[PDB]
Every structure is written in C-alpha cells, then in structure tokens.
Amino acid sequence: KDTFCTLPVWLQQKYREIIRNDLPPRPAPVKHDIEIKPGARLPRLQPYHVTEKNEQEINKIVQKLLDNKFIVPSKSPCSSPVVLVPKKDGTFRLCVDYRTLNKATISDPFPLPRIDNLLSRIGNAQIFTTLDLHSGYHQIPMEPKDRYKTAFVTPSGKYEYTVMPFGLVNAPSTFARYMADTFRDLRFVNVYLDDILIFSESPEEHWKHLDTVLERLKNENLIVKKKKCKFASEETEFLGYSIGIQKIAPLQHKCAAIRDFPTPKTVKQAQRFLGMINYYRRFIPNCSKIAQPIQLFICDKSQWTEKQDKAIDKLKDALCNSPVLVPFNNKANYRLTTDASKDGIGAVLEEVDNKNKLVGVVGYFSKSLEYPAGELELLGIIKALHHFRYMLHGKHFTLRTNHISLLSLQNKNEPARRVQRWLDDLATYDFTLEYLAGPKNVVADAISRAVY
Amino acid sequence: PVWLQQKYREIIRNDLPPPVKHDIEIKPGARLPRLQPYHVTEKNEQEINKIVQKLLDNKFIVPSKSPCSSPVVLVPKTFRLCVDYRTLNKATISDPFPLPRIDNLLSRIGNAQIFTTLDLHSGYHQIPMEPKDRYKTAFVTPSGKYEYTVMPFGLVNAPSTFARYMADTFRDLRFVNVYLDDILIFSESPEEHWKHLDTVLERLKNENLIVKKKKCKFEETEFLGYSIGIQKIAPLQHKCAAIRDFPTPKTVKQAQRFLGMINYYRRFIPNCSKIAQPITEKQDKAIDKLKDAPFNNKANYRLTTDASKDGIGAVLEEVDNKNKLVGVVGYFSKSLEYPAGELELLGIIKALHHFRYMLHGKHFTLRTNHARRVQRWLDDLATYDFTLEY
RNA sequence: UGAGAGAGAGGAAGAUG
DNA sequence: ATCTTCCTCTCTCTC
C-alpha cells in the first residue's frame, strides 16, 4: 500500500509537485456554471443556530478555506446555510446545505458511454494505474459569473466559493466534461466520472503513458490526491469492476444478492423468501405451483429435504433471468428501494413505466454491516445508492425508504442531524423520496434481514 | 483604568473628530427615485429644519442637486429624522448578513464578574458613504435637497454594512459581545478585564472608531434591553415599570399589545403560555398573574419537562456537583395543537429544540414521566445524550 | 424609514396511499 | 390517512 515508490524516479521527481496529499492554496480551463430554472428563486436563507463551541469550529474552517483562496467574502444577494460535520477523526468539515439552490438550478448531466464499452478498451493491458483528483472538487474554477450563487452564510459571516465546492447539483458532470475534454484522444486512458484509468501493455510503454497524462494534468494546474491513487500495479479496481490482466469481472454482480441468498431454516426465513418471490410473481411461469414445496413447509409440517432445495434454486434462477430481469436502457425510469437494519442492507433497482408500475428489475444490492444502528443503517442506504452510482447518473429516480433521518430531506428546513453528513453525496443523486412500508419492502427486507 | 485612560482618550472622546464605506448598487433594470416630499405641518417643518441644520452642522449631509429624490420622515419619541428609502431600496441589490442572535449573546457571558460597556459614538454616522453612490441618498425636504455623506439608517444593507464590519473586527474575542453599535465586554478577574479592555480598545483605535464616553459604563451594566448582573440576568426596571403600569386590556389590539410586550420576556415567566389561555372575567386573573413574574459552558444541567394538554412546559436549571439546584436559566412554554406518552414526548423535543444551542451536546439529565411523527420525535431525541429521571 | 428575533390568527395550491 | 410549499395578517423586541 505504497505504490508511488513503485514508479521510476524520473517520473517521481517530474510530477512530485502535482502528486500531493493535500491541496495547496489556489494558484490563480472549463468552469462550473449554475444555470437557474426560469422563474426559480435563489435561496435567501438564515444561518442555522449552533452552539458556542461549534461556531468556533465553524470559523476555524472558514479561515483554512479563506487562507486557501477557495472562498472569498461576499456581499451576495443570496445565501445558503451551513452544517459542521464532526469527522470520525476528531477533525471537522464544513458542509454547505445547497438543497434550496440545487432545486432552483437546471441539471445538465454529461452524457457518458456505457461502462462495458469502456472496459472493452483495456484489452490486453498489463499494467494499470488509477489517479484520484477527487472529481476536481476544490480545483475546478467556479464561473466568475456564477460565484455569488454559491454564497454560504455562517453565524457571523457570508463567503462565496471560488472553486467548485461539494453539494452542488451538477458537479460530477463538470469534472466529467473536463476529463473528456483533456483525455478523450488517448487510447490508453479511460475516464468516466471519478478516477482516470491508464492502461498499457508494458511498464516500458507505461512510463511514457503516465508521462503524457501527468503532463496534461500539470498543464491544467490540477493536483492528484496521491493517497487515493494506485500506481503501475498488476490489478486495479475501476468503475465497480475488478480490473485484471485479462480478467474484468464486477465487485458485486447484478444478481449476486439473490444468488447467494442463503437457504431458509426458520419458518420466518422461508416466509420472507417466499414473500420476496411473490412480489414478482407476475414475471414467472406459475410461481404459486413451484413455491408449493416451500409454502407447505412454512404452512404446516414438512421436512426441509432436497425437495425444497430444488424449489428455491428454481425461484432464484427465475429472479436472475428474464423477464424478472430487464436489459437496462438510457431512457428508462428507475426506482430504488432500500431497507437497512441490524447487520445488513439490501436494495432493489427496478424499471417503471409512464404509469408508475413495475416492468422488472435491473439489479439487486446486498451488503453486510460491521453505532448506533440509526447512523449505521443510513450508511447502508448510502452504500446501496453508491453501488448504483453509474446507472443512476443523469437519471431522475425515486428512492423509497423508511429511514426517518434521510426522509427529513422532504422538508426544506434544517435536516436531521443523522443525515447531515451525507448531504454532500446525496446532492449528486437526483431523487424523489417516497415513504416505504410493506408489502412494498418485501424484496428489500428478505435481502436485508438475511445476510450471508 | 490608569494606562487605558492615556491610550484611548483619543477615541473615548465626545463629538467626532474629522476604511469601510457603504455602497448602494442598483439592480440593472431599476430606476432611481425622483419622489416629491411628504406633507408637513408648520410646526413639524420646524422640527425637520432644526435637525437638517444639526446634520449640516456635524457635516453629515450636504445640500446637493442630485437627480435622485427620496422623501423624509419626522419621528416622535425629542424627535429624530429618518429618510423614507423604501423606493430606493427596491432598486438596490440586497446583501444579507447575519446579526448576532440575542439568545446567543446572553448565553455566552458565563460566570463573568465585571462587565464594561462601549457605545459607538453616533452609530452609523461613523461610516462614510462611497461618493459614487452618495447622490442616491438625496432627499427633498420642503426647504431644499440634501445628500447623506455618511451612512443613514434605513437603507436595506445598512445593518449588514455595519454588522459585517463589527463581526470582522470582534468575531474572535470570546469575551466581547458586539451587537451593532453596542459592545459588551465580560471578564472573570479585574486583572483579566484590563488586558481585555486594551485589546478591544486597540481595535476600536485601529479603526479610528469613537466611543461616546458619556453614553457607556466601565460590576453591573445593562445591555440589549436586559440587565446583566454579576451572577445573574434579569429584565431591567425600565421596561418592567411600564408592564405593571400598562392599562388592563379593553380592546382587541390591547389584548395582543399586552401578550406582545410580555412576550420578549417569556424567559422569566414560568408556564407563561399556559396562563394566557383566556387571552371574560377570567382575563383579569391572568394579566395579574404574569405581572408578578446563568449559563456556563462547563457546568451540569437538569431539563424538566412535565407537559399535558393546554400547554407544554419546561425549565432548565443549573445543578450542584451532586444534585438539586443552583439557579434557573430559562422557562419554556407553548400551546397546541393524542396520548400523554406521545404528548409528553412532544413536550421533550420541543423543549430540547428550545435549548439546543446550549444542551447539544453536554451531558445533562431529563426529569420527565416514563408511528411516523413519533419516529421523527424519537430520532431528534436520539442526537442528545442525557439520562432520564423519576 | 432598516435588518433580524419571538408569539399568534388565517388562507391558497400540490404529492404519495 | 401520511407529507409537502406558498402567501396574507396581528402583537412585540434588539440596535
């Protein structure tokens, strides 16, 4: 876990200045702009009431930013409030609650290729290197014209951003459009939304490759957040896929969740499994007659022999194939459904017609969890959305959840404390919340309640 | 006060001896006001003319033929002058700056002992005007037209201009509360108050801002309409002697005009909102009941919140190293709006929400007894750490 | 005439079941 | 049944 030393000394020395671990103060391309919805009002919000110590800590950060030239003071005619986020580290984070802004701003998502068309490029590559720029946050200039829109307000101040803060609605497209612009003409570099992938077929050619990409970054006055990068290694991770020499295969397959879904022991476990299948009973040739061996065990008394074992695996196979599964498309209307709990999270992304109703599923999600459970469950939900990052990109969807912290985003006012730390990442998804209570959470629950 | 007297006598000096400048930016589409003056009586015009000279006297305004023309207002109390700038303002870009929260200043004082007070001499009038934008302040009196050379009260961004400036100069002194032109400073030891007084007087001297020495006090002051005592905060007798001696409500407004003034002092009146339930032979027992009627960061507290119907009650008290009481820092009460347990929970979260800017998060204790909107209630409750009581 | 703060009385329109 | 967002008005306070 020290892969920079792994690359030649002449490269180490050439780009030492731009492969840093902390952002130096601003040195001054394409910019981030904020186009407002015709007839929308920019926010004119007061700051949130915080305690003495907290505001001290708020001011500590404003200084660090002022000193970094990321913000200058404003006399802006609008303002958004601010939430201090107490990292797990003892440190602190200033998050600007740009929800009211984001509502009033147009979205211009940058069109990205299918991931599988990108992975097709790596071909017979032998070394890979990934570079992190943290999506160009705090680097990409705000458009001078649009800076006042970013204006935050603390209990005793009013500053505006000069570079691209977190929390703004079209951020990752800006960085995406940027990377396309600088790197689209190199057949050895894959770029998408986050990392830059560099692939070559020999470490010989690789250094000449890195030389070009790092130069181009250096000419953009960009900085590579070293600590995140992986340099010239055999294996690397990219776009949720595991990138190998000749082996590309996802970290969590489309159907892993239902495949490794454990065989039931308790009655309840079976009832939950059956309850899930029942939800998509429509997309399957007579599920009522093939769930019989199971349902009978649940119902009255019968042994869980290999006669249930067959029935289960027949129903699993039914969920992992058409017509339960639908070959995703770009113009589709998605809807994500998450239930998290003790121990684990499960979620389901499903297509929906012009009438809000099932056409099928696009992927299931499952993940185990390591305090309190209120905080831990939300992490689960974030990890589910994260999983579906590249598919939900550009799309408006509907997120169903029964997490009272996340649900507080329905109201315009100051959000619940337990959701505030995820305000910045949430802002990059374009979702409508919807409350969830069974039997609509039957799929998600079975996946959730049963971790593997 | 030996050395300080030497150092800042130059700025602690009545009358203003001859940088931040106020700006007035007009929204692109907008046109400036060319308004005709307000009607005035023969004896009002005299009171106007006596002030227009006083303004001309200290060289705050100059007679100038700007194209712009806003009308003037004569305010009773003595009689101050205010220009109606409402048409001007609607043509100027806004500029919202925070003003210190009052609940928030009273809560900072801690167990500070000796408080000095500074009064910025002639308020906004110590803030020059940017000459380019001077002509916009132009106003027609019946006599002739004038122009403010110095920041007049009653422009949109006027409080923000001064509130910024103050915030920037005094944001990082944990012993100084500066609310616009009023500046409190609170210390523990007299020794420590000297070093403190120097520091703020430096900054006031560094900006060539002037204190009106006559108008300020250097072990007990008054501030923001309150009276901050040594180990106490209590409402002053200035506003208390117009509260008992306020005529019993007979009219509709008077019923509101009474709840309205006793409002700002809700902090002191226990079960306040619950005793105004009538506000009619039962209105009388109520206006008389209310007429009758200390936060240190490091200390422990007890939030008590018994709440049934007809109200939700709560008081927060300072408690001994062991237990029981030390004092009271406020009483909270609200009207509404379903089972007591949930009714007593709403009482808790609306109470916690009230003192959140002190209680979140110290380890205090809760004295109290013992579905979606309750999930929410329960979630808010979770972010506080405490321990329930019988 | 200005900026915020508190308490209170009402009104109009939506969304998901 | 849940839950949003927008507006008018009354009384008061701080400077």
DSSP string, A42-74: PPBPPPPP--HHHHHHHHHHHHHHHHHTSEEE-
- Partners of A401 on chain B (C-beta within 8 Å) are none
Cα–Cα distance measured from residue A433 to residue A212, given in angstroms and rounded to the nearest whole number: 44
Nearest nucleotide from residue A103 CA, by C1' atom: D5
Cα–Cα distance measured from residue A247 to residue A102, given in angstroms and rounded to the nearest whole number: 40
Which value in Å is the resolution of this experimental model? Answer: 3.1
B155 touches strand C (CB under 7 A): yes
Candidates B160, B166, B171: best to mutate against A (most CBs of A within 10 A) is: B171
Residue B314 amino acid letter: A
Decide if A49 touches B, using CB distance below 8 A.
yes
B32-48 as b/e: b if 16+ CB within 10 A:
bbebebeebeeeebebb
Q: Strand, helix or coil at B129?
A: strand
Q: Strand, helix or coil at A267?
A: helix
Pairing mode, strands B312-319 and B300-304: antiparallel
- Partners of A56 on chain B (C-beta within 8 Å) are 174
- Contact across the interface for A155 and B356, Cβ inside 8 Å: no
Provide the shortest C-alpha distance from residue B298 to chain A (in Å).
11
Cα–Cα distance measured from residue A168 to residue B349, given in angstroms and rounded to the nearest whole number: 32
A448 C-beta neighbours (distance < 10 Å), count: 24
- Contact across the interface for B97 and A158, Cβ inside 8 Å: yes
Q: Which stretches of A283-408 are assigned E, i.e. beta strand? A: 333-340, 344-352, 358-368, 396-401
Residues 6+ apart with CB under 8 A from A43: A78, A79, A80, A100, A101, A104
Cα–Cα distance measured from residue A323 to residue A155, given in angstroms and rounded to the nearest whole number: 55
From the CA of B352 to the C1' of C13: give the distance in Å: 33
**Token pair 């009538």 is at which residue?**
B278
| Cβ–Cβ under 8 Å, residues B70 and B83 | yes
Cα–Cα distance measured from residue A163 to residue A139, given in angstroms and rounded to the nearest whole number: 6
Query: Among B69, B233, B61, B87, which residue's Cα sits nearest to residue B154?
Result: B87
Residues 6+ apart with CB under 8 A from A146: A31, A32, A33, A34
**Closest residue to A49, CB basis, from B95, B357, B378:** B357
For A257, the enclosing helix (H) or strand (E) is helix A256-259
For B63, the enclosing helix (H) or strand (E) is none
Chain-centroid distance, C-alpha A151: 25
Q: Which of residues 10-69 of B touch strand C (CB under 7 A)?
A: none
**Tokens (6 digits) for A299:** 């119902």
B119-153 as b/e: b if 16+ CB within 10 A:
bbbbebbbbebeeeebbbbbbbbeeebbbbbbbbb
Structure solved using which method? X-ray
From the CA of A410 to the C1' of C15: give the distance in Å: 11
Residues A113, A115, A121, A123: what is their CA dihedral angle, to the nearest 10 degrees?
-170
Residue of chain A with shortest Cα separation from B108: A52
Helical residues (DSSP H) of chain B, grouped into ranges: 2-7, 44-57, 86-89, 102-106, 158-170, 190-206, 237-240, 252-263, 272-275, 284-292, 340-352, 356-359, 372-382
Nearest nucleotide from residue A411 CA, by C1' atom: D4
B260 touches strand D (CB under 7 A): yes
**Tokens (6 digits) for A235:** 């294996």
A393-409 as b/e: b if 16+ CB within 10 A:
bbbebbbbbbbbbbbbb
Q: Which stretches of B267-347 are assigned E, i.e. beta strand? A: 300-304, 312-319, 327-334
The residue lying closest to nucleotide D15, measuring its CA against C1', is B180
From the CA of A424 to the C1' of C17: give the distance in Å: 31
Domains, chain B, ranges and CATH?
A: 1-22+94-128+157-234 (3.30.70.270), 23-93+130-156 (3.10.10.10), 299-390 (no CATH)
From the CA of B143 to the C1' of D8: give the distance in Å: 39
From the CA of B335 to the C1' of C11: give the distance in Å: 21
B385 C-beta neighbours (distance < 10 Å), count: 11
B223 touches strand D (CB under 7 A): yes
Angle at B287 between CA B284 and CA B288, to 5 degrees: 85
**Closest residue to A47, CB basis, from B98, B297, B356:** B98
Which whole-number Å values give the CA distances from B283 to B248, B270, B332, in the listed order?
9, 18, 22
Query: Among B264, B249, B252, B359, which residue's Cα sits nearest to residue B314?
Result: B359
**Tokens (6 digits) for A409:** 């985003």
